Amino acid sequence: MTEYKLVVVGAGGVGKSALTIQLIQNHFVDEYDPTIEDSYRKQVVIDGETCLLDILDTAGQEEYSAMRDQYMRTGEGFLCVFAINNTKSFEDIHQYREQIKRVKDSDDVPMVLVGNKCDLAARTVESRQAQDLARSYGIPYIETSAKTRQGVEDAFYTLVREIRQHKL
Ligand SMILES: Nc1nc2c(ncn2[C@@H]2O[C@H](COP(=O)(O)OP(=O)(O)O)[C@@H](O)[C@H]2O)c(=O)[nH]1
Ligand SMILES: [Mg+2]
Numbered sequence: 001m002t003e004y005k006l007v008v009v010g011a012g013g014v015g016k017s018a019l020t021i022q023l024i025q026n027h028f029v030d031e032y033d034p035t036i037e038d039s040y041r042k043q044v045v046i047d048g049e050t051c052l053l054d055i056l057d058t059a060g061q062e063e064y065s066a067m068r069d070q071y072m073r074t075g076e077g078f079l080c081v082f083a084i085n086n087t088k089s090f091e092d093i094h095q096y097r098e099q100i101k102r103v104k105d106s107d108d109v110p111m112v113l114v115g116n117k118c119d120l121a122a123r124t125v126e127s128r129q130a131q132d133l134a135r136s137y138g139i140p141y142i143e144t145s146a147k148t149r150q151g152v153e154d155a156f157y158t159l160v161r162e163i164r165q166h167k168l
Contacts, residue, residue, distance in 0.1 A: 001043075003052040004163050006156070007071050009096045010081030011089040012061060015116035018146030019081065020057045023156055028147045035059050037068065046157050049164075053156065072103050077110035077163045079155060082130075084115050084143070085122040090130070097137065110162035112140045114155050119145035 008016045017032035024040045037059040044051050056071040078100050082089040093113065100109055113134045115125065127143065134141030140158050144151035 001050045001052055003054060004160050005071065005074055005076045006053060006055045006159060007075035007078045008055060008057050008081060009078055009100070010114075011083070011086070011092045012059065014081045014083040014086065014089050015114075015144070015146045016057055016059070016081055019079075019114070019116060019144060019152060019155070020055055022146045022149055022152045023053075023055075026149070028149070033059075037065065039067070039071070044157075046160050047164075051160060053160070072100070077112070077159045077166075079114055079159055080111050081114045081116055082125070084117045085120050085124045086117075087124050090115075090125045093133065108166065110139075110159065110166045111137075112142055112155060112159045112162060113137065114151075115141065115143045117145060117147070118143040118150065119147045 008020055010016055012034055018029055020040060021027060021029040021032065024042055037057065039054060039056045042053040044053060058068060080093055080096055082093050101107060113130065115130045131141050142151050142155040142158055144155050146152065
């Protein structure tokens with residue numbers, strides 16, 4: 001059984017808790033406490049491998065945490081979340097990437113770029129813009145909907161695959 005330590009980062013409000021609850025329990029949760037930082041487990045087989053996904057759902061701006069720190073330096077990959085209809089969120093992706101690298105002290109740290117809420121029409125970021133950013137980073141880009149559950153497993157399974165690859 002393989003264990004993979006993932007960290008879910010991104011501006012607050014983008015879909016971290018929803019994305020994560022969806023994978024974990026298969027239900028879209030709105031109303032999830034914006035401040036609750038918690039990690040969840042999920043046993044899943046990916047590509048014929050039995051995996052134990054230990055996910056840190058991050059929360060809290062400025063104020064530091066033992067758990068976040070640890071998961072941050074010890075995490076294997078990071079899901080970088082932004083909201084499709086929220087431009088600052090998207091623009092913030094570069095900072096989260098920059099923080100991850102500083103801690104890891106490394107360029108190649110696995111990540112996937114998640115453009116969430118692909119369910120909404122109130123769209124304010126183009127797939128094209130996001131794809132290209134993904135492409136500048138050398139990392140994949142997934143569009144998800146924690147609401148519709150669309151793309152949710154892809155996102156995380158892709159992240160696992162990256163990790164797996166980064167190991168080789
Ligand atoms: N339409 C839509 N709303 C979503 C989606 N994901 C999250 N939400 C809403 O976005 C808000 C923030 O979600 P949440 O996961 O709590 O944000 P974060 O935990 O702070 O990253 C909530 O009101 C959720 O109901 C999504 O995929 N689509
Ligand atoms: Mg949250």
